[PDB]
């Protein structure tokens, strides 16, 4: 289906514990493929998926210096934003940045993004037109004007509609055999009595990729939206994901509940009944 490439940057000041820490990770869909950690020993951008390794050494040279450049800029921004907000140097603060591009099932540009947070809250973000900005508060407006003055949006728009989609398409092709796979969920049900009159039914989705999935419980065909415990989709550790939905039912009435599993690797959605 559709596809995305996304980079996530985190810069954390740690007064009294050294210089700021910078961590960058790059994803294609739900697959991480690069990593940069300022505390790590290599001081290099590193592969994290087998297919990115077929880039030549000039790739890793160029990636390493651009990532390093962003952390450098983040260090400046940690000091600057502290000014905007009149915060003392004794405090830890965090700048986060996420950007990337989406392509359709045919590799065509769909959307570009770039958003920045400070201390976990929206700071400034690029609008969908990829030419205007939206400042979250008063301090970010100072940045907005700085970035209007420097035509940052046009640098950013040229990247998002240019290199970003180009290398996203490229990575999709070179990693076709894992990135364009779908592993459908392996499903099963568990069942445990809680009392003499109630029991838990738990509906399991294991080993699936991509992470997007929907599990819904129904009773006699009616969504049980409110009474279901649903956990966040979680990584198995091997590139796939897991999720479950559970519901407490009257003991003896299990046959009225159905678990419905929708995932793009499933030709048709699954229905499970105890």
């Amino acid at each position: 289906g559709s596809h995305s490439m996304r980079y996530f940057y985190t810069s954390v000041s740690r007064p009294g514990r050294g210089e700021p820490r910078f961590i960058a990770v790059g994803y294609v869909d739900d697959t991480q493929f690069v990593r940069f950690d300022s505390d790590a020993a290599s001081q290099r951008m590193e592969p994290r998926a087998p297919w990115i390794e077929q880039e030549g050494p000039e790739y890793w040279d160029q990636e390493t210096r651009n990532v390093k450049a962003q952390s450098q800029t983040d260090r400046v921004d940690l000091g600057t934003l502290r000014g905007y907000y009149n915060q003392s140097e004794d405090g830890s603060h965090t700048i986060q940045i996420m950007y990337g591009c989406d392509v359709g099932p045919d590799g065509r540009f769909l959307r570009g993004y770039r958003q920045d947070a400070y201390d976990g809250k929206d700071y400034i973000a690029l609008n969908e037109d990829l030419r205007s900005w939206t400042a979250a508060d008063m301090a970010a407006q100072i940045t907005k004007r700085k970035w209007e003055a420097a035509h940052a949006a046009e640098q950013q728009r040229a990247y998002l509609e240019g290199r970003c989609v180009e290398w996203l398409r490229r990575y999709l092709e070179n990693g076709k055999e894992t990135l364009q796979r779908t592993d459908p969920p392996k499903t099963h049900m568990t069942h445990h009595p809680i009392s003499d009159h109630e029991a838990t039914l738990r509906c399991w989705a294991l080993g699936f990729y991509p992470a997007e999935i929907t599990l819904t419980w129904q009773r006699d065909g009616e969504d049980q939206t409110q009474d279901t415990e649903l956990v966040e989709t979680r990584p198995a550790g091997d590139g796939t994901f897991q999720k479950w939905v559970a519901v407490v039912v009257p003991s003896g009435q299990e046959q009225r509940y159905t678990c419905h599993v929708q995932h793009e690797g499933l030709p048709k959605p699954l229905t499970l009944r105890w």
């Binding site: 980079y7 990636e63 600057t80 934003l81 940045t143 700085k146 940052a152 970003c164 290398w167």
Partner: peptide
């Protein structure tokens, strides 16, 4: 591939 030199906040 990552983006190039950002401006500065």
């Amino acid at each position: 591939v990552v983006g190039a030199g950002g401006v500065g906040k």
